[PDB]
């Protein structure tokens, strides 16, 4: 346990963004994909990347979501851009992102209760091939605390 220091800066985009978080995109062994900028809205989950078109999901869409001490992940359902997956990113700061997501999905007016955690079950086994395009879908999730967004019967 030690703390750091930044040896230089020379970007308009500061360490310390409330809002803005600098992200890497990871797939299943945890290898650096591609970089972007995530962007938190009182709307929806928004991502900044190159040319390539913006990425968001509406926070109705998130049926769970979690973060570790380096790395912050969430489960997208089929209403969405990039289809149903999981999708995780690597952050020094994914705490502040899970912290600022359950905020701003909470400010809509939504019923909410306390409730006991049940036993979640696996899947039988299945596999497949590259389909449609997108992020890195994990088949399984990274993250060792989930939380959970919307709920209705």
């Avoid at 997501?101 to 019923?111: A, K, P, V």
């Amino acid at each position: 346990g030690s703390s750091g220091s930044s040896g230089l800066n020379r970007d308009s985009v500061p360490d310390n963004h409330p809002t803005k978080f600098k992200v890497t995109n990871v797939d299943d062994e945890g290898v650096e994909l591609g970089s972007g900028v995530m962007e938190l809205t009182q709307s929806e989950l928004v991502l900044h990347l190159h040319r390539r078109e913006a990425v968001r999901w509406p926070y109705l869409c998130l049926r769970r979501y979690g973060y570790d001490s380096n790395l912050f992940s969430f489960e997208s359902g089929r209403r969405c851009q990039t289809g149903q997956g999981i999708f995780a990113f690597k952050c020094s700061r994914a705490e502040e992102i899970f912290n600022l997501l359950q905020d701003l999905m909470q400010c809509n007016s939504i019923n909410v209760m306390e409730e006991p955690v049940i036993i979640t079950s696996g899947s039988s086994g299945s596999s497949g091939s590259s389909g449609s395009s997108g992020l890195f879908r994990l088949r399984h999730f990274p993250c060792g605390n989930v939380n959970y967004g919307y709920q209705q019967q």
